[PDB]
Paper text:
Crystal structures were obtained of all three R2lox point mutants in the non-activated reduced and the oxidized resting state by soaking apo-protein crystals with MnII and FeII under anoxic or aerobic conditions, respectively. In contrast, the bulky isoleucine side chain in V72I-R2lox has a larger effect on Y162 than on the metal-coordinating residues. Aside from these two residues, however, the structures of V72I-R2lox are practically identical to the wild-type structures in both redox states. More mass spectrometry samples were consequently prepared in the dark.
Although the physiological function of R2lox proteins is not known, the cofactor catalyzes formation of a tyrosine–valine ether cross-link in the protein scaffold. Two proteins from this group have been characterized to date, homologs from Mycobacterium tuberculosis and Geobacillus kaustophilus. Both contain the ether cross-link, and both co-purify from heterologous expression hosts with a long-chain fatty acid ligand bound in a hydrophobic channel leading from the protein surface to the active site, hence the name ligand-binding oxidase. The two metal ions are bound next to each other in octahedral geometry by two histidines and four glutamates, with the manganese ion occupying the N-terminal metal-binding site 1.
Author numbering:
A (entry chain A), B (entry chain A): 4 to 286
């Protein structure tokens, strides 16, 4: 270290990421350990085997995603720390702790309903793996040796704009469209509501990061759009795979009179993807 | 990634670091933004210039240390993440967020009392710089390329056993011995109480980390002792420098009838150092 900002000066109290950090502390008190999952255990046990499975693809996607994101944010925190972006780092401590609670929430649900011993990796197809097993850690880990604006934009695009701003947001919507209607899994849905609220700050950090780089040179806008489009095939290829699992196993939909509109879910994904694009201004 | 623990299985709910993570969430709700510093501003302004300075060396040491530690824990989190130690990572998200709040607390105090514009690096002598500007980032950053048991023990020794378990603990004691007696700076002392409570978990993570490595091969015990002793000269060399500043500027002690026992503070430092050693068992 050559010096310390809070010895030479203070935190930059007006910095957007300090304000986001402050909001994260105010809004981040929830604890997955307090969620009552006992009704969820009864719901899951009440289900037939073919209804039991209906929910597992989505939980498998979230549980791996939360865990990937918990591990893979560390290089972003490092890169920004090394750039002396102290307020970003303070905020990223809330981001990382949020994702830890997200991992915890889904794992507590799996334990409570009796599937913790079940290996849910069978529900990760090639497109999911390309995003979460490969493209996400590649883009983040790159920041250890290459913290160029190109690398940081690509990292924020994959992590915050695609994984969180497209897939996670759409998954929260899907959970609600399906189980909130069914009256099922109230503990899980309480957790989803807290995850979704945290996610708002995570996406805003991505937007801030990408926009501040675009702000220095509008040609980075083109890079942002390009990286969004490179991942789209895998995003929809996973969505299509989940859709086809749902269409092939309809008993939960039948039993609970959910006219599950998979083409409305698909449209919600397309819509999320397009509005994330629109939250980055070329100028 | 080759897979995900919370897809194949669950969190290891009995893991000591998951239990420490759970305690951190329960005990880590405090927010520096809620501390009332208005009485602290009046106290500081009431002081003469020569009393004003008396407190600044210690705040300078803490503010830089909190900031160093916030940046320099990231490689430990990374190394353990890459080892698949998921429960350690979950706990480290609380550790990192705690230190962010510590940075925030001291910087809020500096702002409130009117010294935020003052560059307090003048109170970092060569021994302080050797620990915080050099040895700490060197030991932590090494973990990016070398996560051997030797490297991890050395990192935990410098960070958790020396910086936190010797210097920080002794600084908390010193703040209380001096200002809690004077009736001064109630907001700062509220913050110190919260820092000290957080620190308990940070030191326990260090103990767990060092002991689990020693447990695999008792020869690492010798390394631990050696790394403790290598840093001791700098620890006491900074303590002696602070002591001599205090002896050379006594007006706060006089004004507030603090018979400040600098040789009792020195003994407290020696005692902390020796009991950290004793918390690691050769077997
Ligand atoms: C059937 C419609 C498809 C809806 C899309 C569902 C997407 C599943 C979500 C899995 C990825 C979750 C990523 C977590 C991100 C974070 O924790 O910030
Ligand atoms: C006059 C007696 C000397 C007492 C020793 C005072 C030591 C000052 C403390 C500065 C280091 C603080 C390190 C912070 C560690 C953490 O935040 O985990
Ligand atoms: Fe997120
Ligand atoms: Fe600490
Ligand atoms: Mn395909
Ligand atoms: Mn010396
Ligand atoms: Mn999440
Ligand atoms: Mn601290």
């Amino acid at each position: 270290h050559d010096g310390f900002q809070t010895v030479k000066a203070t935190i930059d109290w007006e910095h957007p990421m300090f304000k986001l950090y402050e909001k994260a502390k105010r809004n981040g008190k929830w604890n997955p350990a307090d969620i009552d999952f006992s009704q969820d255990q009864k719901d899951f046990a009440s289900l037939t085997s073919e209804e039991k499975i209906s929910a597992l693809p989505l939980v498998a996607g979230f549980s791996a995603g939360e865990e990937a994101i918990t591990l893979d944010i560390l290089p972003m925190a490092h890169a920004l720390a090394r750039q002396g972006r102290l307020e970003d780092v303070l905020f990223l401590t809330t981001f990382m702790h949020d994702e830890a609670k997200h991992v915890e929430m889904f794992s507590r649900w799996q334990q409570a309903v009796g599937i913790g011993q079940m290996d849910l990796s069978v529900f990760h197809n090639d497109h999911y793996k390309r995003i979460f097993y490969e493209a996400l850690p590649e883009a983040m880990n790159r920041l250890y040796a290459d913290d160029s604006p190109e690398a940081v934009i690509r990292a924020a695009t994959v992590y915050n704009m695609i994984v969180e701003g497209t897939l996670a947001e759409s998954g929260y919507y899907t959970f609600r469209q399906i189980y909130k209607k069914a009256g099922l899994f109230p503990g899980l849905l309480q957790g989803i509501d807290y995850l979704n609220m945290d996610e708002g700050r995570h996406i805003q950090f991505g937007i801030y990061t990408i926009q501040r780089i675009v702000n220095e040179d509008e040609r980075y806008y083109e890079l942002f759009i390009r990286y969004m489009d490179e991942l789209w095939p895998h995003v929809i290829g996973y969505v299509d795979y989940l859709t086809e699992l749902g269409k092939r196993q309809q008993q939960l939909a039948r039993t609970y009179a959910l006219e599950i509109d998979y083409d409305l879910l698909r449209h919600y994904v397309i819509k999320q993807f397009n509005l994330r694009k629109k939250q980055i201004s070329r100028t």
